[PDB]
Amino acid sequence: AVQQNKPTRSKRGMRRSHDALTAVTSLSVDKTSGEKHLRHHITADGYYRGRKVIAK
Amino acid sequence: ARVKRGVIARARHKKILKQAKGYYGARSRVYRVAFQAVIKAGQYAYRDRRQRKRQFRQLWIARINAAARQNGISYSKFINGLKKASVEIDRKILADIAVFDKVAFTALVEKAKAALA
Amino acid sequence: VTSKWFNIDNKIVDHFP
Amino acid sequence: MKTFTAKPETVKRDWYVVDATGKTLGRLATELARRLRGKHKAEYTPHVDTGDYIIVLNADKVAVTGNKRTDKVYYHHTGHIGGIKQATFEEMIARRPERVIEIAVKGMLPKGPLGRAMFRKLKVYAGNEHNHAAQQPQVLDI
Amino acid sequence: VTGSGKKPWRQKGTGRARSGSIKSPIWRSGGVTFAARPQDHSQKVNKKMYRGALKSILSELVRQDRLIVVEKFSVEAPKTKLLAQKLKDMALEDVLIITGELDENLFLAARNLHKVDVRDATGIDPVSLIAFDKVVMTADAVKQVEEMLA
Amino acid sequence: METIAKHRHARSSAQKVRLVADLIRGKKVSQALDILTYTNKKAAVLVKKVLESAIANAEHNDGADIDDLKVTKIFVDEGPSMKRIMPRAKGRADRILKRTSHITVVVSDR
RNA sequence: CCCCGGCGAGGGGAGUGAAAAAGAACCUGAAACCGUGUACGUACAAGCAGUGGGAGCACGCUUAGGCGUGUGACUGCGUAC
RNA sequence: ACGGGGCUAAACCAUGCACCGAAGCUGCGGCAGCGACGCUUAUGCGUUGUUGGGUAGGGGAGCGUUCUGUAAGCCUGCGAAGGUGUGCUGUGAGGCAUGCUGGAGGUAUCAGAAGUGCGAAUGCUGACAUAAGUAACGAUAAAGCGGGUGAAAAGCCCGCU
Ligand SMILES: N[C@@H](Cc1c[nH]c2ccccc12)C(=O)O
Ligand SMILES: [K+]
Ligand SMILES: [K+]
Ligand SMILES: [K+]
Ligand SMILES: [K+]
Ligand SMILES: [K+]
Ligand SMILES: [K+]
Ligand SMILES: [K+]
Ligand SMILES: [K+]
Ligand SMILES: [K+]
Ligand SMILES: [Mg+2]
Ligand SMILES: [Mg+2]
Ligand SMILES: [Mg+2]
Ligand SMILES: [Mg+2]
Ligand SMILES: [Mg+2]
Ligand SMILES: [Mg+2]
Ligand SMILES: [Mg+2]
Ligand SMILES: [Mg+2]
Ligand SMILES: [Mg+2]
Ligand SMILES: [Mg+2]
Ligand SMILES: [Mg+2]
Ligand SMILES: [Mg+2]
Ligand SMILES: [Mg+2]
Ligand SMILES: [Mg+2]
Ligand SMILES: [Mg+2]
Ligand SMILES: [Mg+2]
Ligand SMILES: [Mg+2]
Ligand SMILES: [Mg+2]
Ligand SMILES: [Mg+2]
Ligand SMILES: [Mg+2]
Ligand SMILES: [Mg+2]
Ligand SMILES: [Mg+2]
Ligand SMILES: [Mg+2]
Numbered sequence: 001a002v003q004q005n006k007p008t009r010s011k012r013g014m015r016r017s018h019d020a021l022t023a024v025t026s027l028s029v030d031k032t033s034g035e036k037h038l039r040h041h042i043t044a045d046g047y048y049r050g051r052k053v054i055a056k
Numbered sequence: 057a058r059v060k061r062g063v064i065a066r067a068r069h070k071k072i073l074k075q076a077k078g079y080y081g082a083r084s085r086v087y088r089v090a091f092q093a094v095i096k097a098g099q100y101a102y103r104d105r106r107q108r109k110r111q112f113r114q115l116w117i118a119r120i121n122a123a124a125r126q127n128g129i130s131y132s133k134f135i136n137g138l139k140k141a142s143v144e145i146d147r148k149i150l151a152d153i154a155v156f157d158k159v160a161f162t163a164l165v166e167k168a169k170a171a172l173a
Numbered sequence: 174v175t176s177k178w179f180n181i182d183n184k185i186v187d188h189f190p
Numbered sequence: 191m192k193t194f195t196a197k198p199e200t201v202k203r204d205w206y207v208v209d210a211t212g213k214t215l216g217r218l219a220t221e222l223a224r225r226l227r228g229k230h231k232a233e234y235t236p237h238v239d240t241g242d243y244i245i246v247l248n249a250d251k252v253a254v255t256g257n258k259r260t261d262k263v264y265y266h267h268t269g270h271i272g273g274i275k276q277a278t279f280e281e282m283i284a285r286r287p288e289r290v291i292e293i294a295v296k297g298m299l300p301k302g303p304l305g306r307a308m309f310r311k312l313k314v315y316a317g318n319e320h321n322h323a324a325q326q327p328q329v330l331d332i
Numbered sequence: 333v334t335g336s337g338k339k340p341w342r343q344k345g346t347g348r349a350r351s352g353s354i355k356s357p358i359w360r361s362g363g364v365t366f367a368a369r370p371q372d373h374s375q376k377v378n379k380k381m382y383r384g385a386l387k388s389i390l391s392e393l394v395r396q397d398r399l400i401v402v403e404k405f406s407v408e409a410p411k412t413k414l415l416a417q418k419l420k421d422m423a424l425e426d427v428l429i430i431t432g433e434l435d436e437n438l439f440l441a442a443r444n445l446h447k448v449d450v451r452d453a454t455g456i457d458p459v460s461l462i463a464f465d466k467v468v469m470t471a472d473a474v475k476q477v478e479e480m481l482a
Numbered sequence: 483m484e485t486i487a488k489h490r491h492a493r494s495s496a497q498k499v500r501l502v503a504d505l506i507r508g509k510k511v512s513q514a515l516d517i518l519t520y521t522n523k524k525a526a527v528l529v530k531k532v533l534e535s536a537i538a539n540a541e542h543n544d545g546a547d548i549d550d551l552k553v554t555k556i557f558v559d560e561g562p563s564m565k566r567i568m569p570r571a572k573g574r575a576d577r578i579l580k581r582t583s584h585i586t587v588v589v590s591d592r
Numbered sequence: 593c594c595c596c597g598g599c600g601a602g603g604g605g606a607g608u609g610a611a612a613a614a615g616a617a618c619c620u621g622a623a624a625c626c627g628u629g630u631a632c633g634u635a636c637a638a639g640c641a642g643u644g645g646g647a648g649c650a651c652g653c654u655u656a657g658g659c660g661u662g663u664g665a666c667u668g669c670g671u672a673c
Numbered sequence: 674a675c676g677g678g679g680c681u682a683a684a685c686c687a688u689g690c691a692c693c694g695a696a697g698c699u700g701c702g703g704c705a706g707c708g709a710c711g712c713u714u715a716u717g718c719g720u721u722g723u724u725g726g727g728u729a730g731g732g733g734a735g736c737g738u739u740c741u742g743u744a745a746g747c748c749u750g751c752g753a754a755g756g757u758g759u760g761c762u763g764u765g766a767g768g769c770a771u772g773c774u775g776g777a778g779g780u781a782u783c784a785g786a787a788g789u790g791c792g793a794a795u796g797c798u799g800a801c802a803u804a805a806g807u808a809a810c811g812a813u814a815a816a817g818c819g820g821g822u823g824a825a826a827a828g829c830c831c832g833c834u
């Protein structure tokens with residue numbers, strides 16, 4: 001099926017009121033390294049909750 | 057002599073789009089839709105210059121009817137009594153007195169009840 | 174072109190004789 | 191000079207209380223609608239609500255003439271198909287005494303967001319007592 | 333217009349407006365609808381109407397004193413410097429000189445001056461008389477034009 | 483002080499990139515940089531490079547300080563399109579538009 | 593020439609020029625179309641979306657006053673070409 | 674199967690007097706057409722009477738566009754045409770003045786000639802929307818991991834399954 005009238009630029013923007021992205025509320029700070037990371041994720045060099053889990 | 061329609065067409069399109077300011081949607085953006093909107097708005101303005109003289113009289117009647125009934129007389133009997141007393145005050149003025157000078161609108165009602173008597 | 178085979182198919186097109 | 195227009199933020203509204211015992215249903219509802227709308231004031235403006243607040247007491251003792259007591263029927267539709275429901279005047283006074291007066295006054299007011307604002311100034315009670323003693327309602331033999 | 337007489341698409345079924353040629357004036361690069369041909373714009377004026385309008389022009393120049401009559405007008409050498417000085421003495425800026433016979437030297441002197449025209453009584457035309465601000469006719473030229481208009 | 487960085491002819495449509503730019507409008511560049519690092523969108527990589535570059539124009543050219551810069555003004559504009567052809571069934575063909583963008587970031591220390 | 597970037601694309605400065613919003617996609621640079629900012633309206637309200645009436649608000653102007661501009665709650669009438 | 678609320682009259686019959694009610698008629702201001710008659714026109718004015726809904730259609734009078742003469746004139750780098758606002762003005766088509774952009778042309782008056790005016794033709798060409806960040810991403814033979822390079826590796830190279 002296809003439209004009978006051209007939907008306006010307000011109906012288009014109302015449909016997109018639910019299309020926004022949500023920012024990450026906070027980043028946890030590592031216990032020893034002191035660097036931010038996603039919560040429950042290892043940091044960018046392999047520290048997770050103090051210990052170094054990936055010595056790479 | 058070849059004549060190009062460019063400068064002149066733009067002036068005449070921009071005239072109609074200038075009168076269509078405040079209209080929702082394509083009626084203030086698109087010439088085709090805005091031309092019909094400006095024409096239909098000129099028919100309403102002509103028709104409503106006649107109704108402005110009716111809507112306002114209808115309002116003046118209804119404020120005299122309400123102020124007169126506070127003095128114990130209806131509109132139809134109050135207007136008759138002023139013709140019998142040869143008072144030629146306007147309905148636009150009578151409805152004005154009813155709001156701003158309630159002691160002068162009273163004095164008019166005694167004048168009308170007397171002649172109606 | 175012209176088709177839109179269902180605008181050529183004459184069972185679909187020639188439905189009201 | 192232009193005609194005076196009442197301003198929504200400076201209109202004076204007052205509280206009245208009406209007893210509805212033995213009044214005729216429709217011949218009372220027209221006086222309610224007249225004052226709910228403001229037609230009794232020299233400041234009446236069509237697009238402003240200049241009316242008064244009205245309390246109606248004893249709503250279950252209102253009266254109808256003729257055989258309307260058992261023959262007046264109130265229909266409404268629920269939206270679902272086949273949902274046409276009716277009640278007589280007898281049955282609504284039994285169940286919803288206040289609804290009978292409010293239906294009558296509501297059909298006599300203007301339709302639209304201003305006529306719905308007039309209807310909010312009508313307080314209707316089935317009994318004889320009301321909680322608005324703080325508003326100091328005056329008595330109306332209307 | 334250069335092109336083909338092929339029909340761009342068939343008459344029915346396409347969903348497009350009927351077209352029959354790529355050279356029609358509706359289309360871009362098509363013909364002109366009422367295209368021009370070379371034309372002759374010359375009109376006819378009766379001999380009497382032409383001569384009757386020179387008499388009005390001439391008798392009107394006299395009324396507004398733009399007709400100046402002399403008996404000799406000539407320069408001794410074909411030099412634009414000489415004719416320029418001669419015209420300054422008579423206080424003339426732009427002028428049409430009408431002479432009985434075309435002087436060999438007065439012609440060559442006057443053609444670098446854009447506000448000066450030297451002409452023979454046989455070749456005066458209506459637009460020249462109205463155009464220039466002053467007209468100078470030698471005496472032998474006045475009698476030549478009087479007979480020509482009769 | 484106001485500082486600009488642009489990315490003209492970015493290769494993604496404006497509607498997709500506007501989702502990302504609306505996250506960092508009005509934030510400080512410190513918060514903005516770490517928000518952009520943890521959104522899994524292609525447009526966040528593009529926008530982050532324009533932001534890190536505006537920050538750099540502020541010290542070298544304007545002599546500002548990172549600790550108090552804010553993303554005062556960010557927007558995306560529709561750019562030119564590259565038009566292609568997508569062959570469809572039964573002999574028909576379509577028109578693909580590969581849409582681009584212009585990303586502008588403005589950082590101000592005030 | 594310097595700076596961010598991938599020894600990128602793109603940009604910010606510096607410089608040339610009368611002009612660089614004349615920067616090679618380069619005179620002028622309209623409209624549709626798409627955005628960012630500010631003022632006002634809008635989440636109990638039914639329809640060719642205007643027109644007549646009209647409060648409130650915002651910004652100007654000048655006063656011993658209400659005028660201009662923007663918006664338009666509520667309201668009569670109104671079924672495009 | 675009163676337009677509705679409602680109505681025992683807010684129904685019907687008879688009489689009467691008020692009022693409401695139209696772009697009808699009157700009041701006040703203005704414009705134009707046609708007659709009659711005159712300060713005497715000079716083609717106009719004054720008094721007066723009257724008319725002024727309009728399709729097909731007939732009659733009259735104009736605006737603006739490009740080009741030719743007037744014009745080797747006049748305006749213009751102290752800012753032309755074009756673009757974009759604002760104000761004033763005419764019964765209309767329109768005109769005029771000016772802020773900003775623009776950076777070299779424009780053209781009075783009065784005559785002349787027309788490729789002289791666009792919303793429609795399933796009109797023609799170019800740009801750009803809508804549906805919509807939706808369907809789809811082309812055989813249901815199938816991948817998993819380690820190392821390398823690299824700004825970045827599910828897909829590239831190397832190795833084992
Ligand atoms: N419907 C089938 C067969 C078909 C092809 N061309 C047609 C024309 C008319 C009717 C049917 C057809 C298809 O599209 O492959
Ligand atoms: K050919
Ligand atoms: K020469
Ligand atoms: K420029
Ligand atoms: K524009
Ligand atoms: K309205
Ligand atoms: K200009
Ligand atoms: K068209
Ligand atoms: K889309
Ligand atoms: K697949
Ligand atoms: Mg079709
Ligand atoms: Mg051609
Ligand atoms: Mg001959
Ligand atoms: Mg396919
Ligand atoms: Mg094929
Ligand atoms: Mg420079
Ligand atoms: Mg140039
Ligand atoms: Mg340009
Ligand atoms: Mg609300
Ligand atoms: Mg409700
Ligand atoms: Mg009725
Ligand atoms: Mg009357
Ligand atoms: Mg009237
Ligand atoms: Mg009339
Ligand atoms: Mg007529
Ligand atoms: Mg010319
Ligand atoms: Mg011009
Ligand atoms: Mg034409
Ligand atoms: Mg038409
Ligand atoms: Mg194009
Ligand atoms: Mg499309
Ligand atoms: Mg869908
Ligand atoms: Mg789906």
Ligand SMILES: [Mg+2]
């Ligand atoms: Mg899918």
Ligand SMILES: [Mg+2]
């Ligand atoms: Mg595949």
Ligand SMILES: [Mg+2]
């Ligand atoms: Mg791997």
